[PDB]
Write an enzyme that holds these catalytic residues in place. Structure first.
Site, PDB file in Angstrom:
ATOM      1  N   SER A  35     -25.733   6.146  -0.279  1.00  0.00           N
ATOM      2  CA  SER A  35     -24.687   6.575  -1.199  1.00  0.00           C
ATOM      3  C   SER A  35     -24.814   5.671  -2.429  1.00  0.00           C
ATOM      4  CB  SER A  35     -23.304   6.422  -0.551  1.00  0.00           C
ATOM      5  OG  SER A  35     -22.299   7.071  -1.315  1.00  0.00           O
ATOM      6  N   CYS A 119      -0.776   4.226   5.669  1.00  0.00           N
ATOM      7  CA  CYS A 119      -1.167   3.159   4.762  1.00  0.00           C
ATOM      8  C   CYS A 119       0.144   2.892   4.029  1.00  0.00           C
ATOM      9  CB  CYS A 119      -2.249   3.666   3.796  1.00  0.00           C
ATOM     10  SG  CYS A 119      -3.729   4.314   4.636  1.00  0.00           S
ATOM     11  N   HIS A 255      -0.569   3.598  -4.267  1.00  0.00           N
ATOM     12  CA  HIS A 255      -1.480   3.120  -3.252  1.00  0.00           C
ATOM     13  C   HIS A 255      -2.926   3.116  -3.748  1.00  0.00           C
ATOM     14  CE1 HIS A 255      -3.439   2.542   0.587  1.00  0.00           C
ATOM     15  NE2 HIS A 255      -2.257   2.224   1.086  1.00  0.00           N
ATOM     16  N   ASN A 286      -9.359  -0.241  -0.411  1.00  0.00           N
ATOM     17  CA  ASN A 286      -8.145   0.241   0.241  1.00  0.00           C
ATOM     18  C   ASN A 286      -7.764  -0.600   1.453  1.00  0.00           C
ATOM     19  OD1 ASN A 286      -6.075   1.552   1.496  1.00  0.00           O
ATOM     20  ND2 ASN A 286      -7.026   3.588   1.439  1.00  0.00           N
ATOM     21  N   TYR A 316       0.882   6.103   0.313  1.00  0.00           N
ATOM     22  CA  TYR A 316       0.495   7.328   1.015  1.00  0.00           C
ATOM     23  C   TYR A 316      -0.759   7.064   1.852  1.00  0.00           C
ATOM     24  CZ  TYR A 316      -2.803   7.776  -2.970  1.00  0.00           C
ATOM     25  OH  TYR A 316      -3.790   7.518  -3.908  1.00  0.00           O
ATOM     26  N   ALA A 318      -2.857   7.615   6.091  1.00  0.00           N
ATOM     27  CA  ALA A 318      -3.061   8.113   7.448  1.00  0.00           C
ATOM     28  C   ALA A 318      -1.854   8.710   8.163  1.00  0.00           C
ATOM     29  CB  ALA A 318      -3.673   7.014   8.306  1.00  0.00           C
TER      30      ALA A 318
END
Lengths: 329, 332
Positions: A35, A119, A255, A286, A316, A318
């Site tokens: 990636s 989270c 968040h 995060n 905001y 899981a």
């Protein structure tokens, strides 16, 4: 049955943050994954993340953040009546981390428990901390977000392998001259509980050790899809319940899930162009429950945001749960 | 010159109803005495447990919780449309995330409502009850669901003559809401993180995950330490509950200690000095120690059997893991 009460005006008295020493670059997690380094940045907004050491834990980091949050409020562990720890990474089904961080801080006998929302754990904890203080159930509390997610990350899942990091940050909540924490506005969508999840529950794994290992999996397209069309509103409700207009907030701490989405929210929320926006996600990634606390703390050290500033918090994550409220830094 | 609005609403709140759910499978002392040379009768004597319930393999803390809430909800003649939030207390949700809360809430037809998971060891219910009560009085919600769920069976070591016969699975939940007059007294709680190891999982998940070939984790209990702790100090916290509630020992009609151990509770009953006729939860006999779901379940049993009537003034005392406790006085 008697009824008690406490200070009706509570507020964040300070923020203590703890960020691990080890810096992890994308190239680092781009060794087992193809990636493209730069892609991740432009896509998510992340450049680097911090990873805790093997001897550290959600708890150790938690108590450290409190040490600092304590010092910054110019307070003693003797001044705290209770502690709430929000995390999704305390790898013991029991006992909770709270009493340990408490005993570890010196306030060994104070009430406490672990809070686990997505989270969005912090928003719920700060809200509960304020609710308990107004009820007369405590005067001053600690609320700590901690996560040691690195151990739960699969270096080969190119869609969650660069999103999570470890870290902690605490706040001291106590009586205040003027309300410093607005009414909590939260909610969820358990229909999409699978958006962010651990793929194999620990018991299934324990009765199948030879088999696969459990890792957190994130279905970004869906989580961010939901965030895009849902958070702006929860945001307005939060401001609306605090009695403020979108033009009055000075700092916006959403968040640290995705930079691009946070930007979209800035528009939709219709904040002032000169409103400071937490971007700590750049070199911390995060941190689930610890995201917002760390976002704030990062804004303050740089002076970007000043104590007293009017802030809008929006968590905001899981399970698909969120929590938002307006507060003073 | 900024004014951040204060919110509030409903000072008076209480238990609108209780709803329990105990698994189908009845596991006897003699069963676990298939891997342990401990004395059968010795088990009922030293603990007061005859039998316990073990949930199926296809059941979870989450599945049981929703079943409990449905019942809790039915019993209050309400619907998910009437609940504003739900709190799930447990120590047996084997997923670091997502929380069980939204999941169970979706499961009831209220997927959008607020909710989170709260763990305070065996005393998570008392904390969860307090929080729900504090949130409502604060106007953050009008009615709520508080659920206790535990599926500890998967965590028991069949060969541990120390705990193998103590833990069990189950779930009970209450509907918390506005009431004619205060039904939930002020919350008294605390802990002793110094004895964090008293009741615990011997090995963390990540350490096990990195060494699958090695030892699997299990719940371990230092019997004596817990006994010493709970047996001598919960009487004092029970007094704090009543004092904060503004009531006299001789006023409580039903005592509901955490169904941890008979001998321990029999000592608290004595230390508390309640009216001789005061009824005490003995639900442990046929359900064992169901941690977070303990007192809620014990309430359902007292209530369904008629040993306690709606409106009775009861003292709840949760105690256990992490070494935390939470007590309060409520009207059934």
């Amino acid at each position: 049955i008697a009824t008690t009460s406490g200070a009706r005006s509570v507020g964040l008295l300070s923020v203590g943050a703890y960020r691990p020493e080890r810096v992890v670059t994308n190239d680092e997690i781009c060794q087992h994954i193809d990636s493209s380094d730069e892609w991740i940045y432009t896509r998510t907004g992340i450049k680097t993340r911090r990873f805790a050491a093997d001897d550290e834990s959600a708890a150790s980091m938690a108590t450290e953040a409190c040490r600092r949050a304590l010092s910054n409020a110019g307070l003693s562990a003797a001044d705290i009546d209770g502690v709430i720890v929000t995390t999704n990474t305390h790898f013991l089904q029991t006992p909770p981390a709270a009493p340990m961080v408490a005993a570890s801080l010196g306030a060994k006998g104070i009430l406490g428990f672990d809070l686990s929302a997505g989270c969005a754990g912090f928003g719920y904890a700060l809200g509960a901390a304020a609710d308990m203080i107004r009820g007369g159930g405590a005067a001053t509390m600690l609320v700590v977000g901690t996560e040691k997610l690195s151990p739960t990350i699969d270096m080969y899942d190119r869609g969650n392998c660069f999103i999570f990091a470890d870290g902690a940050a605490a706040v001291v909540v106590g009586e205040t001259p003027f309300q410093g924490i607005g009414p909590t506005v939260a909610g969820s969508d358990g229909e999409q509980a699978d958006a962010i999840r651990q793929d194999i529950d620990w018991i299934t794994f324990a009765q199948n050790p030879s088999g696969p290992r459990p890792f957190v999996r994130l279905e970004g397209p869906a989580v961010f899809r939901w965030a895009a069309f849902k958070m702006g509103d929860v945001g307005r409700r939060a401001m609306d319940a605090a009695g403020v207009r979108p033009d009055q907030i000075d700092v916006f701490v959403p968040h640290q899930a995705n930079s691009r989405i946070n930007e979209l929210l800035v528009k939709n929320l219709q904040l002032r162009p000169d409103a400071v926006v937490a971007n700590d996600i750049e070199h911390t990634g995060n941190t689930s429950a610890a995201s917002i606390p760390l976002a704030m703390a990062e804004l303050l050290t740089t002076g970007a945001a000043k104590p007293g500033d009017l802030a809008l918090l929006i968590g905001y994550g899981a399970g698909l749960s969120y929590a938002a409220q307006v507060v003073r830094m």
